[PDB]
Design a protein around this ligand. Structure first.
Ligand SMILES: [Cl-]
Ligand code: NA
Ligand code: NA
Lengths: 305, 314
């Protein structure tokens, strides 16, 4: 029975490497191509599943070979695809990336079938939504669909973890009140608040704005510098001194380790994100439970660390 | 009773086209959002083989793809176009060839090709095809596999008395001289002829002077294509350029029009050997022009049944 349900996006990364970037009208011969699995929703789902969560991916891909390939990737990671939809009306989402020998790139994103995931689709998935322990949402599908997913979780008492990524100025105010845990990065927080965010001190001031819009808990991530947290019952910023790995891990802990303090969950999730950064690649770099330190999965009183 | 012998063998490339449509092309360092993404089956060899097959040729595609989902999908495409895949090889040692394509609202594009498994088509893989090549009427080769593999395919055809149709695309300055001498029909476009001859080519008149250089390198017949403006032909017994023009028209999408033309010509060389070159070229120009009126490269290639009956008369 899925404890973590993710409503969000799946995207295929298509990468070519070339000596130089092409000029208009030019064909250039590359020396390497590869495919990688992405999308914030998928990536967050995959990290949670690798840690041992029972997860379900609510999303929409194309009735095409990339979408069939995505479905197999979710199944290989032990994720339920019962509400992974396939549509003939758009292609599976893509990120095409060309990179030259100087590390300069060009990137073309087509969100495709992700934008077609709608209310009717979420309604069909009510049983898994209502019965989960945590619902995770981002902003790579139609915002209205994310909203409705958060609204459905709330009506069943399911904990809402929201990642407003990519961010948007003029986000619906309902988003803040529907979010039990609202987690974003520095740049995102600048878009959402129109403040500048450079230090951990600025982050704390930006978090407080978001907290005052109605979020229960706000977390602002600081890259490889940790994160800053506030809550309605503790409004003072606490500084705790890859993004999808962190959010996936936090989902896992919210669903399976409710007896941990926020501070501890965030430590463990920072640790797990840092492991993903060291390993080459993207979703493949996400660590499994068996390859991580066993203290990540024990109560505080059980270990000597 | 006897299976139908392949009259056209294409030794050449297959690649998956990964196309994104956008408003404007990205500048260096830029991420942009596109409106649509389209997968298509491409590669100059396969495209030429598909046109020929759609016109009614019995064809065999000698090529190498991956043991990946793109290669599996490519084999099914070939079979759906009635092409023999007996020598469509699959390898775990590389991925299927790709073309990653961005197109703007004006039809301008940037393209990054990775050859992949096309590079791994090798001497042993050709040798297995010896009986099919011996019984063919025409062998068609391009430059999208290892130039040594195309060379061998052309020498195999020549030693078996099979007509060679060679499309030096993409072109390369200082191409091996054997390529000209092994070509019965040598067909390329304006830009390709400039790369090969170091001459400029803008008009049909310039095209004719470039063709005569290529003719003197030992080609039997040379055709220089002029995009939607037809083509120019010369031959050893008729060295004077003939300009075979077309009607000016708005295009829908010209992508793959060149390969349409070469595939049509292969079909005619094999199945209508008694037509004059002038007539074959007219009919092939016409067929290429039909493809331009539809989108999506191979999907735009016309079937026999949808074309005017005069294209198939003697
Ligand atoms: Cl031999
Ligand atoms: Na990584
Ligand atoms: Na076309």
């Amino acid at each position: 029975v899925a404890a973590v349900v993710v409503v969000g996006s799946c995207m295929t990364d298509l990468v070519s490497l070339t000596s130089r970037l092409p000029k208009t009208g030019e064909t250039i011969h590359g020396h390497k191509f590869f495919i990688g699995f992405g999308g914030k929703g998928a990536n967050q789902c995959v990290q949670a599943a690798r840690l041992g969560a029972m997860t379900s991916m609510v999303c929409k891909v194309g009735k095409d070979s990339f979408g069939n390939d995505y479905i197999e990737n979710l199944k290989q990671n032990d994720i339920s695809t019962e509400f992974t939809y396939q549509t003939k009306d758009a292609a599976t989402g893509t990120a095409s990336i060309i990179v030259n020998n100087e590390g300069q790139n060009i990137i073309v994103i087509v969100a495709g079938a992700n934008l077609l995931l709608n209310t009717e689709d979420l309604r069909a998935a009510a049983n898994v939504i209502s019965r989960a322990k945590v619902m995770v949402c981002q902003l790579e599908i139609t915002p209205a669909t994310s909203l409705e997913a958060l609204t459905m979780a709330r009506r069943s008492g399911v904990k809402t973890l929201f990642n407003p990524a990519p961010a948007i100025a003029d986000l619906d105010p309902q988003f803040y009140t529907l979010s039990d845990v609202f987690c974003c990065n520095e740049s995102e927080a600048e878009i959402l608040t129109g403040l500048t965010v450079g230090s951990a001190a600025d982050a704390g001031e930006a978090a407080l704005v978001l907290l005052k819009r109605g979020c229960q808990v706000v977390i602002i991530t600081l890259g490889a510098e940790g994160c800053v947290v506030l809550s309605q019952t503790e409004p003072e910023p606490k500084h705790i001194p890859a993004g999808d790995s962190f959010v996936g891990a936090l989902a896992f802990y919210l669903a399976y380790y409710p007896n941990l303090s926020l501070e501890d969950m965030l430590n463990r999730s920072n640790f797990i994100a840092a492991v993903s950064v060291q390993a080459a690649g993207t979703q493949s770099s996400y660590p499994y439970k068996k390859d991580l330190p066993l203290t990540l999965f024990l109560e505080h009183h059980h270990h000597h660390h």
